[PDB]
Design a protein around this ligand. Structure first.
Ligand SMILES: CC(C)CCC[C@@H](C)[C@H]1CC[C@H]2[C@@H]3CC=C4C[C@@H](O)CC[C@]4(C)[C@H]3CC[C@]12C
Ligand SMILES: CC(C)CCC[C@@H](C)[C@H]1CC[C@H]2[C@@H]3CC=C4C[C@@H](O)CC[C@]4(C)[C@H]3CC[C@]12C
Ligand SMILES: CC(C)CCC[C@@H](C)[C@H]1CC[C@H]2[C@@H]3CC=C4C[C@@H](O)CC[C@]4(C)[C@H]3CC[C@]12C
Ligand SMILES: CCn1c(=O)c2c(nc(/C=C/c3ccc(OC)c(OC)c3)n2C)n(CC)c1=O
Ligand SMILES: CCCCCCCC/C=C/CCCCCCCC(=O)O
Ligand SMILES: CCCCCCCC/C=C\CCCCCCCC(=O)O
Ligand SMILES: CCCCCCCC/C=C\CCCCCCCC(=O)O
Ligand SMILES: CCCCCCCC/C=C\CCCCCCCC(=O)O
Ligand SMILES: CCCCCCCC/C=C\CCCCCCCC(=O)O
Ligand SMILES: CCCCCCCC/C=C\CCCCCCCC(=O)O
Ligand SMILES: CCCCCCCC/C=C\CCCCCCCC(=O)O
Ligand SMILES: CCCCCCCC/C=C\CCCCCCCC(=O)O
Ligand SMILES: CCCCCCCC/C=C\CCCCCCCC(=O)O
Ligand SMILES: CCCCCCCC/C=C\CCCCCCCC(=O)O
Ligand SMILES: CCCCCCCC/C=C\CCCCCCCC(=O)O
Ligand SMILES: CCCCCCCC/C=C\CCCCCCCC(=O)O
Ligand SMILES: CCCCCCCC/C=C\CCCCCCCC(=O)O
Ligand SMILES: CCCCCCCC/C=C\CCCCCCCC(=O)O
Ligand SMILES: CCCCCCCC/C=C\CCCCCCCC(=O)O
Ligand SMILES: CCCCCCCC/C=C\CCCCCCCC(=O)O
Ligand SMILES: CCCCCCCC/C=C\CCCCCCCC(=O)O
Ligand code: NA
Length: 386
C-alpha cells in the first residue's frame, strides 16, 4: 500500500498527542505559577518535567514526523533531529530521580529538609541536569554516529545530493549507543535507582508508623502496670520507662502537652522513690487526662502527616512507573534489533506504535496530578472555569 496512507495515520496520531501534551503541561506550569500552595521544591522538578513534555509536543514530535519521511539531509543535521528527543527523555529521568530523592529526604530527615532542600539549590540542580541532558542526548553528535558510513545506495535512490543521507533514525544513530549507553546506562540504571529510593521511602514510612503505634501502646501498657503494681519499685520501673519514651517522642499545644506529660511523670516518680505507692499511682492516673487531651491529638496528626507522605510518594512513583511503561517497549525493540541480528526487524507498524506510546508519556502526568493531588485538581478547575 502507498506509504503515505500508513504515514498519514502515524502523523495524525502524533499531532493529536502533541496537542494534548502541550495543553496539559502548560496547565501544570500555569497552576504552579498561580498557586502559592504549589510553589515548593518538589514542584519545581514537576515544572521541569512539564517543560520537557511541552517540548516533546513542540519539537520532538515534529522532529519524529520529519525523520519518518527519510528526507534528504546533511547527516549531522539529521542526527540533531534524531537525538533531540533523547535530551528531553534524559531531562525527564533526572527530574523523576530528583522528585524521588526529595521525597526521601522529606520522610527520612524532615527536621533538616527545609534547610537542606531550598528553591535556589533546586533551580541550580535543574540547570545542571538540563546541561547534562544535552550532553548525554547529543553524544552521537560528538562522533558516536553512523555519518562516517552513509548508506549511499539509499541516498542515490532518493536523489539526495552530495554529502546527504536519507534521514532515518536507525541509519544515523548507532544501536550500540541506543542500547548500552542510552538504555542500560542512562535509563535503566536511573530507573532502578528510583525503584530503590521508593522502596526506602515506603519502608521508612512503614517503620515510622509502626513506631508511633508502639509508643502509644507502650504508654498505655505501662499505665496498666502502674495501676496493678503492688510496690513502689514496680511503679518506679514503669515510670522510668515512660519518661524515656516521652522525651523520645518530644524530639505549642503539643509542647505544652509533652511538658505536662513529663512533669506528671516526674511528680509520680518522686512519690514512687519515696515509697508512696498509692500516692504515686494516683499521680500516674493524672496522665490519662494529658494523654486524652494532648498526646492522642499529636499521634493522630503525626499519623495523618505520614499517611499524606505515603500518598504523595505513591503519586510520584506512579509517574515514574508510567514513564517506564511508555518507554520500555521502544527500548526493548532496540534490544531485539541490536542483540538478535538473526531475528527479522520489528515491523514498521510496531515501530510506529512504540514511538507513539513513548510520546503518550508526555500526555499522562497532568492527569495523574488531577486525579491524585487535590491542590492541583482544584487549581486546574479554577483555571478552566475562569
Ligand atoms: C528555538 C527553536 C524553536 C529552534 C528550532 C530550530 C530547528 C527546527 C532547526 C535547528 C537545526 C536545524 C537542522 C540543521 C541542519 C539540517 C540539515 C539540512 O540538510 C536539512 C535540515 C536540517 C535537518 C535542519 C532542520 C531544522 C533544524 C532542526
Ligand atoms: C510491560 C511492557 C514494558 C512489555 C512490552 C514488551 C514488548 C515490547 C515485546 C514483547 C514481545 C516482543 C516481540 C517478540 C518477537 C519479535 C520478533 C522479532 O523478529 C523482532 C522483535 C519482536 C517483534 C519483539 C518486539 C518486542 C516485543 C513486542
Ligand atoms: C524491565 C527491566 C528489568 C529491563 C528490561 C529487560 C530487558 C533489558 C530484557 C527483557 C527481555 C530481553 C530480550 C529477550 C530476548 C532476546 C532475544 C535474544 O536473541 C537476544 C537478547 C534479547 C533481545 C533480550 C535482550 C534483553 C531484554 C530486552
Ligand atoms: C527513543 C528514541 N527513538 C528510537 O529509539 C527510535 C525512533 N525511531 C526509531 C525507528 C524508526 C524506524 C525504523 C525502521 C523504519 O523503516 C524500516 C522506519 O521508517 C520510518 C522507522 N527508533 C529505533 N525514535 C523516533 C524518532 C525515537 O525517538
Ligand atoms: C557526557 C556526560 C559527562 C559529563 C561530565 C562533566 C562533569 C560535570 C560536572 C558536574 C557539575 C556538578 C556541580 C558543578 C557546579 C558547582 C556547584 C557550586 O558552585 O556550588
Ligand atoms: C500544524 C498541523 C498540520 C501538520 C500537517 C501535516 C504535516 C506534514 C507531514 C509531512 C509530509 C509527509 C509525507 C510522507 O510522510 O510521505
Ligand atoms: C488531527 C491532526 C490533523 C492532521 C491532518 C494531516 C494529515 C497528515 C498528512 O496527510 O500527511
Ligand atoms: C519552553 C518550555 C516551556 C515552558 C518552560 C517553563 C514554563 C513554566 C515555568 C514557570 C512555572 C512556575 O515556576 O510555576
Ligand atoms: C531548550 C531546553 C531547555 C529548557 C529548560 C526548561 C526549564 C523550565 C523551568 C524548569 C525550572 C522550574 C523551577 C523554577 O523555575 O524554579
Ligand atoms: C502542535 C504540533 C505542531 C506541529 C507544527 C509543524 C507541523 C508539521 C510537522 C513537521 C513537518 C515535517 C515536514 C516533513 C519533512 C519534509 C518531507 C520531505 O521532504 O520528504
Ligand atoms: C518551532 C517549530 C518546530 C519546527 C517544526 C518543524 C521541524 C522539523 C523541520 C523539518 C525540516 C526538514 C525539511 C525538509 C528539507 O529540509 O528539505
Ligand atoms: C538551548 C538549546 C540549544 C543547545 C543545543 C546545541 C547543539 C549544538 C550541537 C553541536 C553539533 C555541531 C554540528 C556538527 C557538524 O557541524 O558537523
Ligand atoms: C539550537 C540548534 C542546534 C543546531 C545544531 C546544528 C546542526 C548542524 C547541522 C550540520 O552541520 O549538518
Ligand atoms: C555541568 C554543570 C554546568 C553548568 C552549571 C550551571 C549552574 C550551576 C550553579 C550551581 C547550582 C547549584 O546551586 O547547585
Ligand atoms: C548544548 C549544551 C548547553 C545547553 C544549554 C542549557 C539548556 C538550558 C539550561 C538551563 C535550563 C533552565 C534551568 C532553570 C533554572
Ligand atoms: C552500566 C550500563 C551498561 C553496561 C553494559 C556494557 C556491555 C559491554 C559491551 C560489550 C560488547 O560491546 O561486546
Ligand atoms: C540487564 C541485562 C540485559 C540483557 C543482557 C544482554 C543480552 C545479550 C544478548 C547477547 C546475544 C548475542 O550476543 O548473541
Ligand atoms: C549488563 C550488561 C549486558 C552485557 C552486554 C551483552 C553481552 C555481549 O554481547 O557482549
Ligand atoms: C518488561 C520485561 C520484558 C518483557 C518481555 C520482553 C520480551 C519477551 C519476548 C521474548 C520472546 C523473544 C522471541 C524471539 C523471536 C525470534 O526468535 O524471532
Ligand atoms: C497491541 C499490539 C502489540 C503487538 C505485539 C505483538 C508482536 C508482533 C510481532 C509481529 C511479527 C514480528 C516479526 O517477526 O518481525
Ligand atoms: C493513541 C494510540 C493509537 C494507535 C497508534 C498507532 C499509530 C501508528 C500505527 C499504525 C500506523 C502505520 C502502520 C503502518 O506502518 O502501516
Ligand atoms: Na517526559
Amino acid at each position: 500500500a502507498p506509504p503515505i496512507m500508513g504515514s498519514s495515520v502515524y502523523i495524525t496520531v502524533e499531532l493529536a498527542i502533541a496537542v494534548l501534551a502541550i495543553l496539559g503541561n502548560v496547565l501544570v506550569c500555569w497552576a504552579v505559577w498561580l498557586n502559592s500552595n504549589l510553589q515548593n521544591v518538589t514542584n519545581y522538578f514537576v515544572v521541569s518535567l512539564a517543560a520537557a513534555d511541552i517540548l516533546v509536543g513542540v519539537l520532538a514530535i515534529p522532529f519524529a514526523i520529519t525523520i519518518s519521511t527519510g528526507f534528504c539531509a546533511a547527516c549531522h543535521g539529521c542526527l540533531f533531529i534524531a537525538c533531540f528527543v533523547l535530551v528531553l527523555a534524559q531531562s525527564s529521568i533526572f527530574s523523576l530521580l530528583a522528585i524521588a530523592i526529595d521525597r526521601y529526604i522529606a520522610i527520612a530527615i524532615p527536621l533538616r529538609y527545609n534547610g537542606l532542600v531550598t528553591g535556589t539549590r533546586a533551580a541550580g540542580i535543574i540547570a545542571i541536569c538540563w546541561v547534562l541532558s544535552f550532553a548525554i542526548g547529543l553524544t552521537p553528535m560528538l562522533g558516536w554516529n553512523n555519518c562516517g558510513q552513509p548508506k549511499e545506495g539509499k541516498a542515490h535512490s532518493q536523489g539526495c545530493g552530495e554529502g546527504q543521507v536519507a534521514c532515518l533514525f536507525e541509519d544515523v544513530v548507532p544501536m550500540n549507543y541506543m542500547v548500552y549507553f542510552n538504555f542500560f546506562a542512562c535509563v535503566l540504571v536511573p530507573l532502578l535507582l528510583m525503584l530503590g529510593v521508593y522502596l526506602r521511602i515506603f519502608a521508612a514510612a512503614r517503620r515510622q508508623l509502626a513506631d508511633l503505634e508502639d509508643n502509644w501502646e507502650t504508654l498505655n501498657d505501662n499505665l496498666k502496670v502502674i495501676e496493678k503494681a503492688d510496690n513502689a519499685a514496680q511503679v518506679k520501673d514503669a515510670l522510668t520507662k515512660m519518661r524515656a519514651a516521652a522525651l523520645d517522642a518530644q524530639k505549642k499545644d503539643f509542647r505544652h502537652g509533652f511538658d505536662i506529660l513529663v512533669g506528671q511523670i516526674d511528680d509520680a516518680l518522686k512519690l514512687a522513690n519515696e515509697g508512696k505507692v498509692k500516692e504515686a499511682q494516683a499521680a500516674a492516673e493524672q496522665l490519662k487526662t494529658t494523654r486524652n487531651a494532648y498526646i492522642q491529638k499529636y499521634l493522630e496528626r503525626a499519623r495523618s502527616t505520614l499517611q499524606k507522605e505515603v500518598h504523595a510518594a505513591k503519586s510520584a512513583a506512579i509517574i515514574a512507573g508510567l514513564f517506564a511503561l511508555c518507554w520500555l517497549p521502544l527500548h526493548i525493540i532496540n534490544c531485539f534489533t541490536f542483540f538478535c541480528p538473526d531475528c527479522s526487524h520489528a515491523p514498521l507498524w510496531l515501530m510506529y506504535l512504540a514511538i507513539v506510546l513513548s510520546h503518550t508519556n508526555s500526555v499522562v502526568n497532568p492527569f495523574i496530578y488531577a486525579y491524585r493531588i487535590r491542590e492541583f485538581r482544584q487549581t486546574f478547575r479554577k483555571i478552566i472555569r475562569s
